[PDB]
């Protein structure tokens, strides 16, 4: 190739808050993120997610749209009062896509389950790149 | 309590989507869903058609297949970007396609992974159109 169109984005030490009540999906995501050198903080419900976000620098949040007692946009609304941290919504239902697209306080992206975990990594990298200097 | 704003879909109406897809049936279906939501569609079946139609028609967004009969989708993307920075969403199907999306120095505006969820395709097109003025 005579031209340089490709590269490897450096994610080392980026801190990802993974908010997911499903243990196995959360574990899969965590394992894939760590393979890229990212640091992972786990939250299994929204009140925990809000407290962990408030007490620590976070580069990106992967946020379940449906938690046991809060909807994802309720968590995002509270997080946004503390910081402009990028958020990718984890969805599953086509109705979830409608909700995300219509948010007044929007997410940076979404991903639709079931997913190849490599898709999640790609979307995390894309949002981290767009918000590198935000 | 009101968390939503449903006007965002109306902003996509009449925007022009260049759908570059080598499978006639897949492109027919994608076109139908995009038109159902009020967008307009121009169809290209290979890279040469994509380059000609992009050069001559006002295009708001390109939906770009990776596997194409001559130039592949990555090579078409490079030829398109030599002339203009038109937003692009890649239609991917293999893990290796996801790797290549991640490696792009000038990122694709989005991508979607087969099998294609048609409501996800609609939503990602709308989201990129909104982000790119
Ligand atoms: Mg869950
Ligand atoms: Mg999928
Ligand atoms: Mg195809």
From TrEMBL, chain A:
Task: Tell me if Chaperone is a UniProt keyword of this record.
Answer: no
Sorted alphabetically, which keywords does the UniProt record give? DNA-binding, Metal-binding, Phosphoprotein, Transcription, Transcription regulation, Two-component regulatory system
Q: Example GO molecular function term?
A: metal ion binding
Which Gene Ontology cellular component terms are annotated? Answer: cytosol; protein-DNA complex
Question: Which processes are annotated in GO (biological process)?
Answer: regulation of DNA-templated transcription
State whether keyword Calcium applies.
Answer: no
Response regulatory domain residues are: 15-128
Provide the binding site for Mg(2+).
Answer: 20-21, 64, 66
Taxonomically, which superkingdom? Bacteria
Residue numbers of 4-aspartylphosphate PTMs: 64
Protein name listed in UniProt: AdeR
Q: Which organism is it from?
A: Acinetobacter baumannii
What taxonomic lineage is listed for the species of origin?
A: Bacteria, Pseudomonadati, Pseudomonadota, Gammaproteobacteria, Moraxellales
* Gene behind the chain: adeR
Q: Which residues of the full protein are shown?
A: 2 to 133 of 247
